[PDB]
Amino acid sequence: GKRPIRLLPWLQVVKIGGRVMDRGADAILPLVEELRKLLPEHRLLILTGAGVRARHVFSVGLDLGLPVGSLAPLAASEAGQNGHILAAMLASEGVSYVEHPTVADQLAIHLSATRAVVGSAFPPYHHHEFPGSRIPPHRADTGAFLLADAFGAAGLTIVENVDGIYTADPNGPDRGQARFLPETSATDLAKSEGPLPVDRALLDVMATARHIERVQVVNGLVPGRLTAALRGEHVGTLIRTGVRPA
Amino acid sequence: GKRPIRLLPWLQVVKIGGRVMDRGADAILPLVEELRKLLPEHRLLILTGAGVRARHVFSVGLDLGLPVGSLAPLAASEAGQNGHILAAMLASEGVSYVEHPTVADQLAIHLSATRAVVGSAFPPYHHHEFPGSRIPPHRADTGAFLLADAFGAAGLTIVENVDGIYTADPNGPDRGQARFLPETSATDLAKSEGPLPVDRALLDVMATARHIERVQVVNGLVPGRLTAALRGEHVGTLIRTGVRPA
Amino acid sequence: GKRPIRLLPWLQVVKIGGRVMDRGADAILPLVEELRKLLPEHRLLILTGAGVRARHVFSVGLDLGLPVGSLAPLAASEAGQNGHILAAMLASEGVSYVEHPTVADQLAIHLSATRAVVGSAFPPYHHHEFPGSRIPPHRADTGAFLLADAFGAAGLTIVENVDGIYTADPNGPDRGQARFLPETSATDLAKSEGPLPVDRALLDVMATARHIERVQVVNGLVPGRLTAALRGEHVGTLIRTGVRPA
Amino acid sequence: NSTAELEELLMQRSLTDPQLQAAAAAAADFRILPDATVIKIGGQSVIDRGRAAVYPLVDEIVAARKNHKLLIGTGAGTRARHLYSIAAGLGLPAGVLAQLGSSVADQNAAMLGQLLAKHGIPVVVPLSLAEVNAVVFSGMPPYKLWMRPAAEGVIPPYRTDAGCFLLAEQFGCKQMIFVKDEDGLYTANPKTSKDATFIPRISVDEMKAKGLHDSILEFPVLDLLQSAQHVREVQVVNGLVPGNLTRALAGEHVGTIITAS
Amino acid sequence: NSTAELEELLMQRSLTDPQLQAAAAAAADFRILPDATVIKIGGQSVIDRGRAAVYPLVDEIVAARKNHKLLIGTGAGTRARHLYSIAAGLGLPAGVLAQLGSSVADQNAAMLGQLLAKHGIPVVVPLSLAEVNAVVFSGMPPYKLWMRPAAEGVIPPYRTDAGCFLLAEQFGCKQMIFVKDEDGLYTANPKTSKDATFIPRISVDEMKAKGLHDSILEFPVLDLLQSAQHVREVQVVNGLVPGNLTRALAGEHVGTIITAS
Amino acid sequence: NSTAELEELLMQRSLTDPQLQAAAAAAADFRILPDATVIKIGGQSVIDRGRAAVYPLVDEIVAARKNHKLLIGTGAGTRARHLYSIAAGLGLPAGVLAQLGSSVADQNAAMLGQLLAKHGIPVVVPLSLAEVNAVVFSGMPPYKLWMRPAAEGVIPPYRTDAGCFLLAEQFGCKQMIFVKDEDGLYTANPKTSKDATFIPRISVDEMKAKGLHDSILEFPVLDLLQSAQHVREVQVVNGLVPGNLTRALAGEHVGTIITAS
Ligand SMILES: Nc1ncnc2c1ncn2[C@@H]1O[C@H](COP(=O)(O)OP(=O)(O)OP(=O)(O)O)[C@@H](O)[C@H]1O
Ligand SMILES: Nc1ncnc2c1ncn2[C@@H]1O[C@H](COP(=O)(O)OP(=O)(O)OP(=O)(O)O)[C@@H](O)[C@H]1O
Ligand SMILES: Nc1ncnc2c1ncn2[C@@H]1O[C@H](COP(=O)(O)OP(=O)(O)OP(=O)(O)O)[C@@H](O)[C@H]1O
Ligand SMILES: Nc1ncnc2c1ncn2[C@@H]1O[C@H](COP(=O)(O)OP(=O)(O)OP(=O)(O)O)[C@@H](O)[C@H]1O
Numbered sequence A, B, C: 001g002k003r004p005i006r007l008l009p010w011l012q013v014v015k016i017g018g019r020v021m022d023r024g025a026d027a028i029l030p031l032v033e034e035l036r037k038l039l040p041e042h043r044l045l046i047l048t049g050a051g052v053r054a055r056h057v058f059s060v061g062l063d064l065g066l067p068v069g070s071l072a073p074l075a076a077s078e079a080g081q082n083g084h085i086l087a088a089m090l091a092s093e094g095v096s097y098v099e100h101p102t103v104a105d106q107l108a109i110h111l112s113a114t115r116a117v118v119g120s121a122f123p124p125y126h127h128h129e130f131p132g133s134r135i136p137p138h139r140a141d142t143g144a145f146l147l148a149d150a151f152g153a154a155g156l157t158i159v160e161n162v163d164g165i166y167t168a169d170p171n172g173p174d175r176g177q178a179r180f181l182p183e184t185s186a187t188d189l190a191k192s193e194g195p196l197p198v199d200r201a202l203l204d205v206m207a208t209a210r211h212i213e214r215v216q217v218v219n220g221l222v223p224g225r226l227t228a229a230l231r232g233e234h235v236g237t238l239i240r241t242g243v244r245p246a
Numbered sequence D, E, F: 001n002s003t004a005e006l007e008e009l010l011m012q013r014s015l016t017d018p019q020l021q022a023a024a025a026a027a028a029d030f031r032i033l034p035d036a037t038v039i040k041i042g043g044q045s046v047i048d049r050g051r052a053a054v055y056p057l058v059d060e061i062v063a064a065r066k067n068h069k070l071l072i073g074t075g076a077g078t079r080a081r082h083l084y085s086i087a088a089g090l091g092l093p094a095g096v097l098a099q100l101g102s103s104v105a106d107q108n109a110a111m112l113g114q115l116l117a118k119h120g121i122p123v124v125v126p127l128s129l130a131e132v133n134a135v136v137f138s139g140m141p142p143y144k145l146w147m148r149p150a151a152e153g154v155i156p157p158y159r160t161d162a163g164c165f166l167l168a169e170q171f172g173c174k175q176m177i178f179v180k181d182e183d184g185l186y187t188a189n190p191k192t193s194k195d196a197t198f199i200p201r202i203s204v205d206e207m208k209a210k211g212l213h214d215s216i217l218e219f220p221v222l223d224l225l226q227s228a229q230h231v232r233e234v235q236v237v238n239g240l241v242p243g244n245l246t247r248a249l250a251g252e253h254v255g256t257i258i259t260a261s
């Protein structure tokens, strides 16, 4: 196999759900305070998802008939805006938003200059998004995983508005049926039909992953869960990717 | 009122007049030596104005009939050139010129990497400059103030080729009439007709300011005045903006 | 004469030959390990040349009839790719590739953020390359020298796939005739006809140089030679530029 | 004044000097794109409504570029309101909000541009206007962190009405048309008032005296209009009425004409 | 489905929800550039061969833009293979290799563009296609570090065949033509087999069943083709035969037609 | 030579090898824009003089693009001299001065472009030249910190005459016209000498032998001209004489023709 080297083995990647950001100050201010306290402990790439505004731009674009390659960058823009908001809240700590080309080619120098940077979790697929679904498949969870695994990062933690993955949507019509899953494999999730709090494409990129062995989904609405997850404590749903350790 | 947060509360902003730079080495070399000594004491955003070359491009552009939105970027270019000159003199200290998009979105990381950066004091109004006068209204003093107040900086100091504000142009035809003003309010200045060493638009943005309570105009041709001003010592004209303190 | 100031007097510039990179891991991995050990000792601008892929793009472009200003950027691209490869190998040390505009205007801040950066050694002559030869004259050695001398750097070391300069190509048809030259002047080299391991244009820019007094060409295939050269030890061919010291 | 006096003043006085300001005011007046019309396509009022609103306007744009040179700017709409609400609740300043709103106007420009791409019309000017007679652009001004705040609150006061107006003014365009979702200005907001009366024509001063400073247009735009050198009136029309943009471009007095004086 | 049900689902469900996915699938289908044809000019198969291969194709491109709108994408070729070998030997991941390959496709686009510049054809779309009826572009997808790796190895699986195909699909183009150095698909690689048989027409499923998943096209492209909404077949032709591109654009069945179903 | 020998040399020798250099010299010679003319509009000599100089040349440009393809480059002028003086007095090197001068040439390109925008002519090439028959560009070479210094002093030796010339040469243009403020070359500077004599035609070697190496053109341009493959003569004309540019484009021998040999 001779797996590729780890480019940034000391990096921790944290993906913040766009729906967490959508809650506004009530959710953002505690998260910002938790992130502030984490800056001296970890070297962080903080990546934001898109949330509800992307649903609105999908509503308009689908009504206009636009293809999935048109909707992809329109959604990515909302993740970038969430990133600019979050970075502004951390500016006094030396944190700025960095653009995709900079993340791809200059992340090492930026994390030498400061303890954390913020970027968009969506990948720059743009009009080269894959066809099949009218909804862009490669979204924020998928982008953050592709980047974390390409860098060989020490981890990826996904910060959600729920405790983790359930057997049904815990806010949906089958909500009394929904049982919490403390641990699962990506392959098991991929064989289930039904909604998830993570992109289905995340499960596919986990199958070809070369470094990241597990990803934890934790509730960002509960202070302390992100901090615990970054220390490896089990406070949400662990997803095993199928990368086998030494 | 619930005034907005301070993004970079520890930042000191210093605007260097383009007419100071126009004096060449005789003025620049002492200023560079003073700035060098300030780097360990303060976290500095150093912004340059335009000076005499913008007067020349206005002479040509007005002769060609060009509108105020055309003249605005042409003047801003001269402020950028002054910034590149000044930054080059400080390069051996780790100082570089940073472009407007970087100032707007990545200043925090840049001031984590190094003790000071240089940028253009003009705001990027470009062809969206306001009509009314044939001379661009939003110039270097105004841009530097908008940025310092938006960031919630600890101060803005304006470095001039005169001791401060007088009751008439101290180099003009009414020069024996000109009396020095140690302190004034922006509202009082705005109600005076006659020339000033600062943009009239500066007084307008001071009226809507949310953080900066005072701005000092000091003579950059006198070594030590910038250093004193950055420590709050009264060595020029203090302009009260009308932001009320706690 | 009143020679210009040194912008970055503490900088060491190292040019890595594209033909060294072309040897792949067998040459790159030892060089990366040597560079890693040099990061705490020196402030480095590491610039990569182009190598064999530029010969291929010249073969195609010349067959298509393209002028020298078309071939120049096509070759420069290969030097950029070598730079991205080398920087990736050093990313875990905080090293990234930086683009030409950043090298030209923001190098000081980047070397404040981290101990070394990588860039392309070719100069951005693009379609403004000089006519005369169908092969672009201002290549990687020339670009690296122009930059090192413009910055007033402490040195430029050229890392080659041979011990230095010989009196004939030591890999060519007159290879038994080839005698090693421990020291030479640029003026003496310029008066010789025959191939060299450095651009002929390097000798021309050495004649107008203002700071760099000597450039050493050393064998990057021998571990330790770059380290010794950066300490001034004579382990290859020294080229005297004709800049006279104090 | 005279060229020599102007150049003397430009060298010897501050730009704030009233004598220099007056001499510059006497300079000749070049219009860069005098035969072009700027149109703003509303975000909340048009694009956010989807196909039923956008497709007819696409058809009108395609028909109009035959005899009319068009600069077509986009508004922002509900997604910008959402961003402003999130950011305002965090205490972020107007300059930060400005960049957020710009991204939404850009999304709208991309959507409209893709519907016009097969007609040759790009999202961006001189070459496009010469060949395909139209371009699409995002309407937000580029002020970013240097946005002047309003007297109260953190919502950027110069948004997409201002951006489009300023481009029309600084290019010296012949006409500025705002495409919204109401027939024009009324004596009261027609969506929240039962018996509002339609106003075909009004001056900025009359609007202020009637309490209408902040009604169908960003009120800062009305002051820009009074300061303008080239665009001294604007027209506001209902983009939801078929053919309304075509008729306004033909000189029909649909909607409301707001004059500087 | 219905617009109201779709908007309800879009607000209240995860994008992963099968009910939301199905409602979005019922949306109308706009083609952005329906009258354009995408052509890929091979790197190893054409451009790397120099004048003898490129000049005749330049002539055909110039002749074709008279009656055909063309988006002309470039492959990468031997210099990208060299970069992949160097980087793979260092243990660099697919995402790093992706950017290296993009630079080579860009070099090829620049070379081809310079030969077409005097004909008005730029290297880059809507304005160019409206006026000069063609553009040149680099064929590599923009995925960079976010390239999905293959199941085995570090060679990027989505290279210039995929990039060109995806642009044809997302612009809703009428036709996708891959210009290579063989007459079409054979039952075996014609360069390494003596008695390979030519295949004029085949479906993706038939190719897989015959062991031809990775033959004249990147095998990931065949799966993209089966998922495509707009481009449901492709044609592969020999660019080294004079006039072959002209004939394919005229509807002649030169080469091999590969169908999604 | 032969293609096989060239490729052998390109792989096996240093690019400095005289045998490789000679084989590359035998390569075919493609002209990218053979029907275009490059014109330099002087900074100090034309644009700095304002309307009286610029407006007539605008009129001539508009008239000429009807039958002539034009690449119009701008000089820099007095503001660049000011920047050079400030920076030279600080001890800054030629590479720093180069970027300062570029900004001034860019300002001049923007001013000229805005006067031509309504005629379709952009500031920047292939698409513009195909459609509106002209483009405007800033004349400074892009060398920035990599500018080669002169033998003495820190003033960049390759400024806007060199930049425009090099573009004409590398695009293989048919003609290079420098538009200045004197009728042509004289035996002495006509502004500082009473009885200077006009020279209609001269070679570079003759200029050097007469002491005129650095007269109406940057002297480095004369050496570039002697090395050029495509542009082997240039014409220098007075842009202040009405119609002079039109007449030069029509083949009239106004001004001075300087030949490489
Ligand atoms: N099986 C499931 N387990 C947990 N949550 C689920 C499941 N299925 C659906 N959900 C829903 O997914 C929601 C999270 O929404 P989503 O994943 O779209 O937001 P996000 O991750 O914040 O957004 P983005 O992807 O833009 O960053 C939860 O609030 C929950 O209602
Ligand atoms: N009331 C006043 N008090 C002081 N100086 C005045 C006054 N009115 C005019 N001036 C003039 O303003 C001059 C400063 O010029 P100005 O403000 O344009 O330069 P600057 O600030 O260096 O330029 P820039 O705005 O481009 O940075 C002083 O030298 C003085 O002659
Ligand atoms: N006089 C000479 N002395 C030493 N080497 C020579 C001489 N003449 C030719 N050479 C050849 O030059 C080779 C180095 O090739 P070259 O200088 O093109 O590579 P590089 O410097 O790695 O490439 P690049 O310029 O793209 O960075 C040596 O291996 C040697 O064969
Ligand atoms: N007196 C009035 N007459 C007419 N309309 C009014 C009046 N007062 C308020 N309005 C409202 O102004 C609205 C138009 O402003 P709105 O900001 O929605 O336009 P827009 O250009 O679509 O904005 P954006 O592009 O920023 O989304 C109308 O929908 C109407 O409800």
Ligand SMILES: Nc1ncnc2c1ncn2[C@@H]1O[C@H](COP(=O)(O)OP(=O)(O)OP(=O)(O)O)[C@@H](O)[C@H]1O
Binding pocket: E041, E042, E043, E044, E045, E046, E074, E075, E076, E077, E078, E159, E160, E161, E179, E180, E181, E182, E184, E185, E186, E187, E188, E189, E190, E191, E212, E214, E215, E216, E217
């Ligand atoms: N069954 C087959 N039928 C036809 N050709 C085949 C088959 N199997 C393999 N090939 C090979 O596929 C090659 C075309 O693929 P190749 O990657 O060279 O094309 P390309 O588009 O030029 O690539 P790039 O642009 O990435 O350089 C042919 O040269 C042929 O040798």
Ligand SMILES: Nc1ncnc2c1ncn2[C@@H]1O[C@H](COP(=O)(O)OP(=O)(O)OP(=O)(O)O)[C@@H](O)[C@H]1O
Binding pocket: F041, F042, F043, F044, F045, F046, F074, F075, F076, F077, F078, F159, F160, F161, F179, F180, F181, F182, F184, F185, F186, F187, F188, F189, F190, F191, F212, F214, F215, F216, F217
């Ligand atoms: N022998 C000569 N014959 C003619 N003109 C000469 C001679 N020697 C010097 N000159 C001067 O050269 C000048 C033209 O050069 P100048 O640099 O002003 O041109 P420019 O293209 O406008 O420059 P820039 O664009 O860099 O401002 C003329 O104004 C003239 O005074």
Ligand SMILES: [Mg+2]
Binding pocket: A017, A141, A160, A197, A198, A199
């Ligand atoms: Mg989620």
Ligand SMILES: [Mg+2]
Binding pocket: B017, B141, B160, B197, B198, B199
């Ligand atoms: Mg001032």
Ligand SMILES: [Mg+2]
Binding pocket: C017, C141, C160, C197, C198, C199
């Ligand atoms: Mg070499």
